[PDB]
Amino acid sequence: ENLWVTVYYGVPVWKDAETTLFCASDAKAYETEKHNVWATHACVPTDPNPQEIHLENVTEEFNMWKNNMVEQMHTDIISLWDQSLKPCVKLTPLCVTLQCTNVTNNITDDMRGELKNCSFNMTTELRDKKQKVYSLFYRLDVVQINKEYRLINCNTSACTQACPKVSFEPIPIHYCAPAGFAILKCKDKKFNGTGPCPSVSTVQCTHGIKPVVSTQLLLNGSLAEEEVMIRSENITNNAKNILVQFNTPVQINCTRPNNNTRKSIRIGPGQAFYATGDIIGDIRQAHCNVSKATWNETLGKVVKQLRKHFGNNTIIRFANSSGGDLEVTTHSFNCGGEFFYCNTSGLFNSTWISNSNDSITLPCRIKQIINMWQRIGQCMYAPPIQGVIRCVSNITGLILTRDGGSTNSTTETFRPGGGDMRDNWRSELYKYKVVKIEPLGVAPTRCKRRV
Amino acid sequence: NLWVTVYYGVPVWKDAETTLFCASDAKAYETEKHNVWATHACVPTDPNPQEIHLENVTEEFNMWKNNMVEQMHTDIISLWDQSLKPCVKLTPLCVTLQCTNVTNNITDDMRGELKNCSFNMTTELRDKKQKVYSLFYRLDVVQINKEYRLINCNTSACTQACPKVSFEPIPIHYCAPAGFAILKCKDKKFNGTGPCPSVSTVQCTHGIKPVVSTQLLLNGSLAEEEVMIRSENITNNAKNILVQFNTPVQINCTRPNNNTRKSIRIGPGQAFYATGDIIGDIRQAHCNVSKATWNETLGKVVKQLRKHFGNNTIIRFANSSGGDLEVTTHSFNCGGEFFYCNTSGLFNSTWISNSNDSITLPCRIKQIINMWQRIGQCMYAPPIQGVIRCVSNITGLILTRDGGSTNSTTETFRPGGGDMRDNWRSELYKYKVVKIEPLGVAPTRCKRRV
């Protein structure tokens, strides 16, 4: 009777909010300090061990398509990329007349005219003298003027050579919230893209996330458990990309058989330009290998899960990209310090009706001048890497776009996408959510203050 | 028996200085036009003012010693050059120019104002030269020894403006930080300095347009029912005199020339927008002010000046005494095109013991300017397509005195602007910044229980 107002401090009440999360590097990455591109030297070291705290009898709503964590990640990584290019050389005087001729030393039928021997007049250490130099350039980096050739970037923007002392290895990074904020992780395994999460556990902050940039595929990502998960903002709408996750990873081997030597050319006082000197041995096209038995088995898992939403009678068929720029129609990634753009038409070619060393090869080319962030005016020239390169990756997902459209046909067409580069990072931040803590709360009870 | 008692939060303030942050509306933020003044980075303003009418309080004010105008002058200059870094700098434009007069449809009044210059220019390739031509005004070219060169070549590298950003002034609001307050005086009769019987406090100042002009105040706040004349020393001639109009006068400015922009492609990713041929007739830019309205506001101004100089003296108006084009002309911008108008036709009259004529003023256009009286800086305005027509209203004057050699019978007033700091005093004269001091001690008959 006559219950009075009582205020409690430190009550566990939270709601959604926005904040600027900070980095948290590992102990190993905080000791080498070998001038990483992502400026991990400034990043604070992380906690010695995870401090996950499980919450019982809690229900929380999640939304991976409107989460602001990916926007912060997307905004940051661009700034980190730009910051690492300022203190190294700028290739402003390379825009000059080029006389390029084909190389026919030990070429292959595939590499008929993929390499050009270009010679040009470049400035020496002295401003009053110019020395004739030569280099090898890929066809994708030279455009004919009318013979006479010139770099593609000359008429759009002059940009910086990729710095030679910096590395592009995607070391894991941890995104962590400041005081007064908490991160909630959804431990449910059937969480598709939205809904209450039966098991929500708060954590100190997110786990290691590798900033891998790829298109049409997800490389070195996270693996689902005992299920294949398909996530989309709106399955009915065909304009929304479809995200797939693999429980069992499939391995892809990519290599460059060509052996080339790096040659340094002095373009001015204190500035050096590294160019491909010569190729030792035969010249062959680069390619990637994917096991047919594993890929076909993985595709069988995908269609079974994908057939649930569109009907168990629907016929599933796959096709290559619908056309467009080289950045979207091909699979883009890096292996060391060289960037690939590979034709994956040999993977998405099947038709499903639903009643061991083939090593599917994906021949492809290599480009040196790249606009990674799909922005006009900021390119980069990656210097050649000495010797052959080899690397293996984990294919942990796909980005598929459905192009059915017509309602008069039962069969549905799925094609690889990759138009937006936020999808690669959204597939790893979907579990986490950011909330703020409000310690002030008022509850009624029986308590009085002495006069 | 009196004992010390302490109170926290008493309304006591003292004069001080602090850094004030910006406040802007959502009009420019939604459009995303990337203005020179970054409203997106600027803090959004309050939905409505929260002024409080204070009673029984008298506070001193001083616009001449006000520190707010110092911060506004520094901030605007800092914002001006912050937008010039991205776009191209015309470092290779210092070459030999072969210029010749144009005589197609030139009127005698503009016989030699603009030339036709041709010169070699660089391209993306560092081994090719292109021969192009552009039209430059006479004020921007000087004979080196025909051969001509830009005035900035022996001064500094001359950077041009970014075409995307616009120079149209937009209102801004100044807000005191936490723990500080701003006091506003609502007394209409309040002159430059003195106690204010009515004082009010606001969290953010009213919208202020950073219009830059000389000898004339354009698009500014007006007085109430009278014409206010403010000067830190009316007797001293060296101090400028500020005038505020109760009723504005409209001025029409236009550039009849119809020039075509030509984007000359130089360097990788760089662009130089030169002036092409003018189609049709070529005539000078001019500005009109109504003679009936202008003569009416002079009669109000002279009456106010009689109070501070006797009701029997003779007030005379004269044009600028002398100097360069910057200080002897009404400098302003109009739709991205800068103007330097000759205002000798306004201040030509005498008053003793007391029909749309549309007074026209010849004006000139300059491309290379020094915005803030600095040396070694440029802002090369790109040409604008079509004809430019902007309508503005004058809300004040800046005047200076001279002579006074013990002859108290005639007074001469001439236009003159020392700097743009006095330009913004007419808008910041009613605002001052004070800091709150919550702590206080008072005597009361009370103790502490032990």
């Epitope: 003298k129 110019k130 020395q131 004739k132 | 081994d127 030269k129």
Partner: antibody, heavy 136, light 109 residues
Framework: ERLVESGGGVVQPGSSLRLSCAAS????????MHWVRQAPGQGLEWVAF????????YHADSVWGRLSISRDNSKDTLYLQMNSLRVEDTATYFC??????????????????????????????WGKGTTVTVSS | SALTQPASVSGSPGQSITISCQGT?????????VSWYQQHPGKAPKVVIY???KRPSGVSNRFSGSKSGNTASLTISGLQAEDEGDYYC??????????FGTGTKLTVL
């Protein structure tokens, strides 16, 4: 700024011989050299030309595939090799330098590969030469 | 194809003489690279014309040369005793080879 030729002698037809030319006082690695032979009562005859780095070699049609020419910038010497000499092959061979210099365009000096010299298409300095005769 | 030259040219001192040296239009008039040389017994030949029509440093200014279409000639004004000797004309070929002319013998009266 001086060239000396040596290696003359008397050989039977069908034999082989080599002539050596040396350069001093100037850069041997930047300018190309020629080979000319003359006989009493006969005009000058051009034999061959070699570039500064020996990228390509030019030989006269009348002696095509007869005389082999090579140079060694490290040793600062020039070599002239001929095989199966004939009775008419006797002459006075001279080691001759071709003058060259940077090309001047747009205000700058344009050199060749590895800081080479563009030929100016005239001969300035000539060697004293050596006389050789063939007898059976 | 060797250049064709007159067998001999004679001229008294103080007069003006002309020497003809002709080959193929492509070889001579094509590459524009024409040179002239002067030789003395017991001495190597010395270049007398630096360019196709320009003299080098360290030579008398009396020498002069000209070209007219396919035809080119050398003119010497004010002949002297020291002008006696052998003269040759050299030019590049179409295939960047060097060809020597037949040669002309000069007789001083």
């Amino acid at each position: 700024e001086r060239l000396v030729e040596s290696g003359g002698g008397v050989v039977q037809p069908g034999s082989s011989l080599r002539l050596s030319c040396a350069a001093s006082g100037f850069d041997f690695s930047r300018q190309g050299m020629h080979w000319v032979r003359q006989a009493p009562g006969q005009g000058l005859e051009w034999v061959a030309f070699i570039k500064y780095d020996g990228s390509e070699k030019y030989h006269a049609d009348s002696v095509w595939g007869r005389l082999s020419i090579s140079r060694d910038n490290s040793k600062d010497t020039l070599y002239l090799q001929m095989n199966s000499l004939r009775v008419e092959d006797t002459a006075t061979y001279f080691c001759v330098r071709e003058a060259g210099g940077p090309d001047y365009r747009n205000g700058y000096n344009y050199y060749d590969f590895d800081d080479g010299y563009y030929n100016y298409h005239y001969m300035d300095v000539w060697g004293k030469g050596t006389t050789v005769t063939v007898s059976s | 194809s060797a250049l064709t030259q007159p067998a001999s040219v004679s001229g008294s001192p103080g007069q003006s003489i002309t020497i003809s040296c002709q080959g193929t239009s492509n070889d001579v008039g094509g590459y524009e690279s024409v040179s002239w040389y002067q030789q003395h017994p017991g001495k190597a030949p010395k270049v007398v014309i630096y360019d196709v029509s320009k003299r080098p440093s360290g030579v008398s200014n009396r020498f002069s040369g000209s070209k007219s279409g396919n035809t080119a000639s050398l003119t010497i004004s004010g002949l002297q005793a020291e002008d006696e000797g052998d003269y040759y004309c050299k030019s590049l070929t179409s295939r960047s080879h060097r060809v020597f002319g037949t040669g002309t013998k000069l007789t001083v009266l």
